[PDB]
Write a protein that binds this DNA or RNA. Structure first.
Lengths: 79, 105, 99, 94, 96, 82, 102, 91
DNA sequence: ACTTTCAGGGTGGTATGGCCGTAGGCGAGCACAAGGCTGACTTTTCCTCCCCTTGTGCTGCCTTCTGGGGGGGGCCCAGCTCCTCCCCATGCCAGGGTCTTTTCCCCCAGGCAGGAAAACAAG
DNA sequence: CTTGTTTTCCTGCCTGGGGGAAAAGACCCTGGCATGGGGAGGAGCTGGGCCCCCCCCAGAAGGCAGCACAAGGGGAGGAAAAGTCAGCCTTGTGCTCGCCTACGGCCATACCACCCTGAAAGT
């Protein structure tokens, strides 16, 4: 139960980065659900890569491969 | 030993790029002008983003390009944003913009 | 009377502050716990690199910002200034993530 | 330990050529490597598919040109193709 | 007798959503395709299957774009689709 | 033949496509907006197909070229080979 | 080899495609066998539904319209083929509840 | 001549829909379906070896290629079919 | 229905991979503050949601007239095949030039304090 | 509109910390040699894509009636914003244990090249 660690101030800060000026009271739960779905999608691919490599730790390379497999290629963390 | 990079005028790895092409399993054979073209293209794409991020840094009175400058260059130039539209850049943030509706009258 | 700012100026100042920074707006320890409890559903006794966790977080803190920008555009379209779950749903259904 | 490879020295040389008084961080130097490798994968895959379409056996500068033309938009593709063409002509005709 | 405005609308929607044929006129579409390709290359030939494929691609793309435009119009609490809805759908999709 | 063929996409055709989409009522500017949208989309796809043809040194655009051009944009097209 | 491993798909042909497709420098002799079964399963899956749709229309032949309807009705198949433009397939009949007359 | 999967797909229908037929246009749809899918599983297993510094594409990489690209219950049945094929093949 | 093209059985080699030994770099785990961030409360102000109205643009209908569908035919350039053989790319080895990892130190970025300036809001 | 009042930005000073240069090594870049093989070119061929002819009839375009729907205006109530205060818990640091992973060595067998043929599929 650590999705609540994505706090209302945190979601509000993300919205302010996104240009949102006013925020409804039900936006936070929806954003938490969306974040959970995105993280599930990325981490399933990362864990599958790790299992294929016969490794026990997910690597930044596994994460980048998982992100690249969903059209979300990430820069910086290797390549 | 005369390096193909110096003979052509490039700065990227003509030889190692040829080796990566051959080991990358992109074709049974690889032409001699293939890596020269590819290295030239990659070096030009590097020298575009690097120049734009240097301009972004100079506009910030800085002299050490950080990821923020790279993203400010890429998302401010119309072409590289199109090329990298599905690319996430670490430690770069977002562009500064506000919708005119939310601004006070 | 004690000084107070009319609703909107502090929000706009927050916007101007957080669009000029590059930091991470989610606390690292609870995001690590979230990442690890999610990965627990795919592989038990799994281990994570610091770069791996900080590369998952960086992806999240741009996905959510993009979704918030599209939701804000939806709210502006619907003759409103407050973004809403229906606007988020419309944004996601249009970009194709989930219908 | 192992010997790891990258494009860091070449990026640094072109960066000193284009910006002779400014620097770059070790995070932007970790971004540029990923950028170079992603573009490499893009153009290499496109050229491979382009050569396999025409039932050709060898990737050639012509397929690289076509892959650039199909991956980059507008002036990006125009200038990339011009630079690659000039490089290949100068290389081969030397 | 005349039907109230809207029942004919739903009937038209149903009829053309239960159909498969090409809703654009083939000869003017082919003329448009030749007009577009003329700028890319003069003296260009074409295949009947190629033009048919282009027409089906464009038609399915338009039909999807119109579903998204109708979604935007319903979001704005409306029934009349407008350029505003088209632009919102295209922007959120990422084509603009 | 080569001038002002976009109007060949007539108002009834655009309304028919809208009815297939699900549109119940149509504004008067929708027709021109859709015409411009189709112009741009066809420009992109036909450019990709013409490049895919010029590589093969061919002079005829084929279903192969069209399907390759459309697939490299995400929109895979079935039924015409490949 | 296809008869040995029980596949209606050509093991030799898929092996030749793997070796000539230039995916790697060596191709093990379990990749064609796995592929000529995965492809077979996928085709059977999008053939059963695209013939059930034909049965739901009192037809004996499968048409691209039936294929499109089956693909769009199936959840996983639609997710996999999310960007597939099928010619002569049409679109699913979908009228929003709001637009329906009160 | 153009080799195709029309003969093979025509036989997988007879074991699932033994009485219905396939129109010629539908035959061209599925030839595009198998060919496009084949270029996706093979292209996924090609990158896995490159990441893994390996050299031979095997059944261990096709499995990872399939379960990466196929959603949910599709992967759990596509992997199951292939495993039963190689197991029978060697045996 | 024939054929012609390609997949299968057998041989030989070798190179890629499988298994055991290893050592160390980093990932997990545990205290410990303690200040920075987060949670609950309160005022209230402004935003959202409904309602009315109207005029105006959209729709249903009719009629006319076009121009798209439906063939039929000629031709002539463009896409496919076949064979030659030659120039390009490949396999192998030798030696060094370049790229790679460690070391350091100094200039650039970070933190803080002080003051000035620029918006905000009641008034 | 003045003015008090916050919040932010510039300038200066101290500091720390990480990038740019120096030094050595270790790994494959390039040159030299021998060689098979794929594609560039020339000829033949054939087929389909363009252009034109004719017709006609279904659909588009213009005009009108009429009607219902979007956009402006009004009101109210309720729900986030902003500020305040109390609490708690990230996190920066320090420290340890131990695991796992990249490397290294040796060899074991699966795959590639090749020779022939009989069978499978495409017209």
């Amino acid at each position: 139960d650590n999705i609540q660690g994505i706090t209302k101030p945190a979601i509000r800060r993300l919205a302010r980065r996104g240009g949102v000026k006013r925020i409804s009271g039900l936006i936070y739960e929806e954003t938490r659900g969306v974040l959970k779905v995105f993280l599930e999608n990325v981490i399933r691919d990362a864990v599958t890569y790790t299992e294929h490599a016969k490794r026990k730790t997910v690597t930044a390379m596994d994460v980048v491969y998982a992100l690249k497999r969903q059209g979300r290629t990430l820069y910086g963390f290797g390549g | 030993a005369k390096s193909r990079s110096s003979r052509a005028g490039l700065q990227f790895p003509v030889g190692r790029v040829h080796r990566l092409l051959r080991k990358g399993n992109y074709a049974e054979r690889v032409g001699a002008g293939a890596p020269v073209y590819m290295a030239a293209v990659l070096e030009y794409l590097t020298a575009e983003i690097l120049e734009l991020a240097g301009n972004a840094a100079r506009d910030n009175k800085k002299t050490r390009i950080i990821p923020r400058h790279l993203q400010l260059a890429i998302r401010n130039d119309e072409e590289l944003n199109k090329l990298l539209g599905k690319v996430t850049i670490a430690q770069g943030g977002v562009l500064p913009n506000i919708q005119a509706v939310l601004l006070p009258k | 009377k004690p000084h107070r700012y009319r609703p909107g100026t502090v929000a706009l100042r927050e916007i101007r502050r957080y669009q000029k920074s590059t930091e991470l707006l989610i606390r690292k320890l609870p995001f690590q716990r979230l990442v690890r409890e999610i990965a627990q559903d795919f592989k038990t006794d799994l281990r994570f690199q610091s770069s791996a966790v900080m590369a998952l977080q960086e992806a999240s803190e741009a996905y959510l910002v993009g979704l918030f920008e599209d939701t804000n555009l939806c709210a502006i379209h619907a003759k409103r200034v407050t973004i809403m779950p229906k606007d988020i749903q419309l944004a996601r259904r249009i970009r194709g993530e989930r219908a | 330990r192992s010997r790891k490879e990258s494009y860091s020295v070449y990026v640094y040389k072109v960066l000193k050529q284009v910006h002779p008084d400014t620097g770059i961080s070790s995070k932007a130097m970790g971004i540029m490597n990923s950028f170079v490798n992603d573009i490499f994968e893009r153009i290499a895959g496109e050229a491979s598919r382009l050569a396999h379409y025409n039932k050709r056996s060898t990737i050639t500068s012509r397929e690289i040109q076509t892959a650039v033309r199909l991956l980059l938009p507008g002036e990006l593709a125009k200038h990339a193709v011009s630079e690659g063409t000039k490089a290949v002509t100068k290389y081969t005709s030397s």
